[PDB]
Symmetry: none
Subunit: 73 residues, 10 copies
Amino acid sequence: VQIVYKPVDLSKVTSKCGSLGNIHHKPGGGQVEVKSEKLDFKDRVQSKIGSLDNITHVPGGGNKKIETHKLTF
Amino acid sequence: VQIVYKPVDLSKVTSKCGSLGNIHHKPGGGQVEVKSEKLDFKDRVQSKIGSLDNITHVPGGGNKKIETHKLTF
Amino acid sequence: VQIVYKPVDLSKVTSKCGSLGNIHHKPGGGQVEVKSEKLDFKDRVQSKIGSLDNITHVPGGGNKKIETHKLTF
Amino acid sequence: VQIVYKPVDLSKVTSKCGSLGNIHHKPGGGQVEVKSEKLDFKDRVQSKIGSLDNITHVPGGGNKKIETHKLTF
Amino acid sequence: VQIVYKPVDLSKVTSKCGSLGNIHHKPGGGQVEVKSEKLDFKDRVQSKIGSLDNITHVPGGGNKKIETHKLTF
Amino acid sequence: VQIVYKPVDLSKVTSKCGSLGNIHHKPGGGQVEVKSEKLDFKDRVQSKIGSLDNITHVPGGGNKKIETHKLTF
Amino acid sequence: VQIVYKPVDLSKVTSKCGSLGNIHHKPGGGQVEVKSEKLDFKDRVQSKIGSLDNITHVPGGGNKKIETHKLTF
Amino acid sequence: VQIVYKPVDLSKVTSKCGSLGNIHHKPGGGQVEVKSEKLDFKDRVQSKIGSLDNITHVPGGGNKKIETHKLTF
Amino acid sequence: VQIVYKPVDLSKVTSKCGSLGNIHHKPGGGQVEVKSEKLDFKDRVQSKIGSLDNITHVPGGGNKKIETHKLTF
Amino acid sequence: VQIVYKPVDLSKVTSKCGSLGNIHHKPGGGQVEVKSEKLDFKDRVQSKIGSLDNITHVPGGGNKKIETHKLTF
């Protein structure tokens, strides 16, 4: 049994931008309420209860490259 | 048995942009309410209960490349 | 048994844009309410209960490339 | 048994745009209500209950390319 | 059994940006309240209860590259 | 006397090709026989005498652009 | 006398190729025989006498751009 | 007399190639025989007499750009 | 007399290649026989007599840029 | 007389290559026989007589840039 794994990657993910500009994030404040009582969490539990998130994300390029290789035998 | 795996990738994902411009995110605030009582979560549970999300995402290119390779035997 | 896997990819996903311009996201605030009582979640459960999402997404190109390879034997 | 897999891809997915222009997303706020009681979810359940989504998505090209390869034996 | 794993990667993820510009994050303050009583958490539990997050994230390029290799036998 | 020589060239010479295939150059061998006595070559003489050439030229595009610009007085 | 020589060149000579394949150059061998007595070469004489050439030239693009710019008085 | 020589060159000569493959240069051997008596070479004489060449040239792009700029009085 | 020689060059000569493969240079051996009596070479004579060359040239890009700039009075 | 010689060069000669592979240079051996009596070489004579060369040249890019700048009176 001979297995040869030799992929070749010369790719690119790119961007160019002159300027981004004026970005205004100004939401009115809101109200979030949760009236639960019992929260018993177990065994791989990911939980967000009752939240207010104000997020401004402005990268000067937010390019992503995800690459996965796998050889099993 | 001879297996040769040699894919070749010279591709590109790209963008160019002169400017983005003036971006205004100004939603009226809202109200979110949850009146649940028992939240027993277990064994691979992903949960978001009761939330208000104000998100501005303005990348100067948000290009993505996802590549997966897999050889089993 | 001889298996040769050698695909070739010289492709591109691209965009060009002069400017994006003035983008106004200004929804009236709304109201979201959930009156449930028991939420027992288990074994690979993905759940969003009671939410208000205000999202502005304005990438200067949001091009995507997804590529999957698989050889089994 | 000889198997040769060598597809060739020199394709492109592209766009050009002078400007996008003025985009106004201004829906009146609405009301969403759910009066359920028992939500027992299990074993690969994807669920969205009671939501209000205000989404503005304006990419400067949102071109996509999806490519899948598969060789079984 | 001979296994040769020699992938080659000469790729790049990059961005260029003239300036980002004036970014204004000025949300109205909101209110978040949780009225739960029992939070017994165990065995791999990730939890955020009752929060207000004001985040401004403005990298001068926030490009990411994630690469995974795996050979099993 | 005002001349102003300003030609503008924004041209392209291009090609795309999936595959160049199988090229087999297998001519039978031949014979070249040349008899002479006196070779008197003077003043910018260029010559090839008695020769045998087997040439395989297989470029992945052999595009050419040739230009001459001449201005005199 | 004002001349102003300012040609502008923004041209491209390009190619793309997936694969250059299988090139087989296998000519039979031949014979070259040259008989002479006197070779009198003077003043910029260039010559090739009695020769055998087997040439394989297989570039991954052999694109050329040649230009001449000449101004005289 | 004002000349002003200012040509502008923003050109590109480029290529992309996935793979250059399998190149087999296997000519049969040959014979070159040259007979002469007197070789009298004078004043810028360039010559090649009696030769056998086997050349394999396989560049990963053999792109060339050649230019000449000449101004005289 | 004012000359002003200011050519501007922002050009590129480039290439990309995944793999240069398998190059086999295996010519049969040959024979070169040269007979002469008198070789009288004078004044800038360049010569090659009686030779056999086997050359394999396989660069990972053999791109060239050649330029000449000449100004005279 | 004012000359002002100021050419500007911002050019690039470049290459990228994943792999240069397997290069096999295995020519059969040959023979070179040269007979002469008198070699009279004078005044800038350059010569190669009776030679056999086996050359393998495999650079990871063999890019060249050559330029000449000459100004005279």
